[PDB]
Amino acid sequence: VWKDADTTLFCASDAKAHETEVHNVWATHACVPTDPNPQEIHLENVTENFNMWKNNMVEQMQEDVISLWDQSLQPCVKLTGGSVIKQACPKISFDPIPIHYCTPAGYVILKCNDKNFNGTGPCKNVSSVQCTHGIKPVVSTQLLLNGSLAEEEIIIRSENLTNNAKTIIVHLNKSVEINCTRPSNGDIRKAYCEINGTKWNKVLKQVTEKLKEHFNNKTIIFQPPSGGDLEITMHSFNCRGEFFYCNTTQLFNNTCINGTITLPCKIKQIINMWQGTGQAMYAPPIDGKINCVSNITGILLTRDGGANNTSNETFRPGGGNIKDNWRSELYKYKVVQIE
Ligand SMILES: CN1C(C)(C)CC(NC(=O)C(=O)Nc2ccc(Cl)c(F)c2)CC1(C)C
Ligand SMILES: *[C@@H]1O[C@H](CO)[C@@H](O)[C@H](O)[C@H]1NC(C)=O
Ligand SMILES: *[C@@H]1O[C@H](CO)[C@@H](O)[C@H](O)[C@H]1NC(C)=O
Ligand SMILES: *[C@@H]1O[C@H](CO)[C@@H](O)[C@H](O)[C@H]1NC(C)=O
Ligand SMILES: *[C@@H]1O[C@H](CO)[C@@H](O)[C@H](O)[C@H]1NC(C)=O
Ligand SMILES: *[C@@H]1O[C@H](CO)[C@@H](O)[C@H](O)[C@H]1NC(C)=O
Ligand SMILES: *[C@@H]1O[C@H](CO)[C@@H](O)[C@H](O)[C@H]1NC(C)=O
Ligand SMILES: *[C@@H]1O[C@H](CO)[C@@H](O)[C@H](O)[C@H]1NC(C)=O
Ligand SMILES: *[C@@H]1O[C@H](CO)[C@@H](O)[C@H](O)[C@H]1NC(C)=O
Ligand SMILES: *[C@@H]1O[C@H](CO)[C@@H](O)[C@H](O)[C@H]1NC(C)=O
Ligand SMILES: *[C@@H]1O[C@H](CO)[C@@H](O)[C@H](O)[C@H]1NC(C)=O
Ligand SMILES: *[C@@H]1O[C@H](CO)[C@@H](O)[C@H](O)[C@H]1NC(C)=O
């Protein structure tokens, strides 16, 4: 017998104590080794309600990632609340590793195994586990990278679809590779991302058909972000310690919905910190080829308001709230206390 509850989680990883890579260094001091023989108990005739949008596991992961970035990625100049911090900004080894979240004694994690589970409401196939699967703390906007895929159909997630102010998470069931490169040797901040247009347009077409099921067969239209900070209007992510900002206008092409799509990107030193600590200037890029190949496994969308009297619904790539990134992986878990 159990009940919904929050508690202090701990983390587990397969980090190497000899690695200089910052995620390894953090997890070495902050996490324990993973369980080689994880146990999972499938419950019968159990109905449990879940709510990915109000899940304390998300806040805790956010706190971990903030801590990790604080100890690892130091900008040359910090501009937080009037005060200005000048400090050293060495180039680091950066590559996210899977982090597992685990409950202490007296608590268990319930896992929803329904194939079409949207993140909220009752779940019929529930199991109890001691730790979540390995989740890479990938910080990005617009596109969710290196995540897990939906096992069956594409899933649409939202706290309230009728509320256009609520972010929509699209969970893909098939990944699409995005290949980003800052050439070696010139504009040292110029870069680009390559995507297979055939693969992407097919997936995007399926996303539209899925959105139709949720919006009463209205016509689905994609548009580039209306405005805001560069972190929102562009697909921003971190590759090898360098902050990439990529223009995704070509990705959401309504006409296409087959060749290589090349997105124009820039490496930026001056960034609005996702932690919410204001603005910061990081160090200039390293020399040589800077390359990251990632799997697109999710999309963050914001729906246009004021379209009730039309047959169209307009969706733009957006987001910015990094907690949503963790929600896209933590949606199927919740903590309960055992009695
Ligand atoms: C709290 N708040 C929210 C989350 C509400 C929105 C917004 N978010 C970002 O500016 C942001 O996420 N930037 C960013 C930076 C680097 C990378 Cl790599 C990236 F992906 C994104 C501003 C702040 C103040 C942080
Ligand atoms: C629930 O999961 C079981 C396997 O654990 C499966 O046999 C069953 O079809 C699932 N029920 C649903 C979601 O229809
Ligand atoms: C998720 O499922 C719940 C319960 O069936 C439902 O109320 C809600 O509308 C669904 N959300 C989405 C995004 O389909
Ligand atoms: C990228 O996607 C492929 C196909 O789903 C997968 O085999 C590979 O492990 C993924 N790489 C990751 C998760 O970084
Ligand atoms: C992804 O989901 C869609 C329905 O949303 C389905 O038609 C398609 O077969 C799925 N793709 C794969 C490879 O399972
Ligand atoms: C969802 O959003 C709509 C529009 O803001 C609102 O009228 C409605 O009350 C919301 N539904 C819930 C369950 O809060
Ligand atoms: C990434 O793109 C570069 C060319 O821009 C290419 O040399 C490399 O093979 C690509 N990587 C993958 C995984 O296709
Ligand atoms: C792009 O993806 C398609 C499958 O959708 C594949 O057949 C084709 O080889 C890919 N293009 C390249 C250049 O790899
Ligand atoms: C969309 O149209 C199909 C016919 O292809 C219909 O069966 C279905 O009920 C419609 N869905 C919605 C949500 O309006
Ligand atoms: C993306 O590129 C298009 C085409 O050049 C341009 O019109 C648009 O302003 C760019 N978006 C951003 C946010 O820079
Ligand atoms: C959308 O695709 C069409 C078809 O090639 C292309 O001509 C156009 O440039 C694209 N629109 C964009 C990315 O603004
Ligand atoms: C995604 O995972 C791949 C394979 O581990 C890695 O090379 C790439 O840098 C990752 N992308 C991001 C943005 O972390």
Q: H/E/C letters for each residue in the chain?
A: CEEECCCCCEEEECCCCCCCCHHHHHHHHHCEECCCCCCEEECCCCCEEEECCCCHHHHHHHHHHHHHHHHHCCCCEEEECCEEEECCCCCCCCCCCCEEEECCCCEEEEEECCCCCCCEEEECCEEEECECCCECCCCECCEEECCCCCCCCCEEECCCCCCCCCCEEEEEEEEEEEEEEECCCCCCCEEEEEEEHHHHHHHHHHHHHHHHHHCCCCEEEECCCCCCCHHHHCEEEEECCEEEEECCCCCCCCCCCCCEEEEEEEECCEEECCCCCCEEECCCCCCCCEEEEEEEEEEEEEECCCCCCCCEEEEEECCCCCHHHHHHHHCCEEEEEEC
| Short-list 121, 119, 97, CA closest to 31 | 97
Contact call for residues 211 and 171 (beta carbons, < 8 A): no
Instruction: Compute the distance between CA of residue 73 and CA of residue 80 in angstroms, rounded to an integer.
Output: 16
Q: Which amino acid residue places its CA nearest to atom 11 of ligand 7?
A: 179
Q: CA–CA separation, 215 vs 261, rounded Å?
A: 29
Residue nearest atom 11 in ligand 6 by C-alpha distance: 160
Confirm or reject: Cβ of 202 under 6 Å from ligand 5: no
| 247 pocket-lining for ligand 8 (C-beta < 6 Å) | no
User: In whole angstroms, what is the distance from residue 222 CA to residue 206 CA?
Assistant: 13
Compute the distance from residue 149 Cα to the ligand 5 centre, in Å.
Answer: 11
Ligand in nearest proximity to the CA of 204: 5
Number of Cβ within 10 Å of residue 245's Cβ equals 20
Strand-strand pairing, 260-267 and 40-42: unpaired
312 lines ligand 6 (CB under 6 A): no
Nearest atom of ligand 9 to the alpha carbon of 214? 13
Atom number of ligand 3 nearest to Cα 156: 13
Tokens 């901040």 correspond to what residue?
189
Phi/psi for 48 (5° steps) reads: -120, 135
The rounded distance, in Å, linking the Cα atoms of 107 and 49 is 17
Please give the Cα distance from 281 to 330 (Å, whole number). 31
What are the Cα distances from residue 102, in Å, to 30, 69, 93? 13, 21, 27
80, β-bridge pairs: 83
The residue contributing the CA closest to ligand 6 atom 2 is 163
Residue ID of nearest Cα to ligand 7 atom 10: 179
Q: 158, 124, 106: which is closest to 46 by C-alpha?
A: 124
CA distance 275 to 136: 17
Sheet holding 270-272, edge to edge: 83-86, 77-80, 279-281, 270-272
Q: Is the CB of 160 under 6 A from ligand 6?
A: yes
For 142, other C-beta atoms within 10 Å of its C-beta total 27
Q: Is 40 in the pocket of ligand 1 (CB under 6 A)?
A: no
- Beta carbon of 181 within 6 Å of any ligand 2 atom: no
Distance 160 CA to ligand 6 centre (A): 6
Number of residues in the chain: 339
In angstroms, rounded to a whole number, what is the distance separating the alpha carbons of residues 68 and 92?
A: 13
Measure 274 CA to ligand 4 centroid, in angstroms: 26
Give the number of the ligand closest to the Cα of residue 209: 5
- Can you tell me which residue has the tokens 């949720």? 214
Position in ligand 11 atom list of the atom nearest CA 253: 1
- The sheet with strand 100-102 has its strands ordered as 32-33, 10-13, 100-102
For 326, phi then psi, to 5°, come to -70, -35
- Just give the CATH number of 1-339: 2.170.40.20
**Residues contacting residue 18 through CB under 8 Å, at least 6 positions apart:** none
Q: How far apart are CA 60 and CA 73, in angstroms?
A: 20
Give the torsion sign (CA, 69, 71, 75, 79): positive
Instruction: Name the residue of 51, 158, 163 to mutate for ligand 6: max ligand atoms within 8 A of Cβ.
Output: 163
Cα distance between residue 271 and residue 282, in whole Å? 8
- Residue 73 identity: L
Residue written as token pair 């949008």: 53
**Residue 85 and residue 230: Cα distance in Å, rounded?**
23
How far, in Å, CA of 56 to CA of 159, rounded? Answer: 15
Q: Residue ranges per domain, the chain?
A: 1-339
Q: Backbone phi, then psi, for 135, in 5-degree steps?
A: -115, 120
Phi/psi for 238 (5° steps) reads -115, 120
For residues 123, 128, 130 and 131, what is the CA-based torsion angle, rounded to 10 degrees? -30
List the residue whose alpha carbon is closest to atom 6 of ligand 3. 121
For residue 163 and ligand 6, the question of a CB distance below 6 A is answered with yes
What residues have CB less than 8 Å from 294, skipping those under 6 apart? 138, 145, 146, 177, 178, 180, 237
Q: Whose CA is nearest to atom 12 of ligand 4?
A: 146
The answer to whether the CB of 322 is under 6 A from ligand 1 is: yes
**Resolution of the coordinates, Å:** 2.0
Contact 149, 173 (CB under 8 A): yes
Residues 6+ apart with CB under 8 A from 27: 11, 13, 15, 97, 99
Q: Residues 6 or more apart from 38 whose CB is under 8 A from it? A: 129, 130, 131
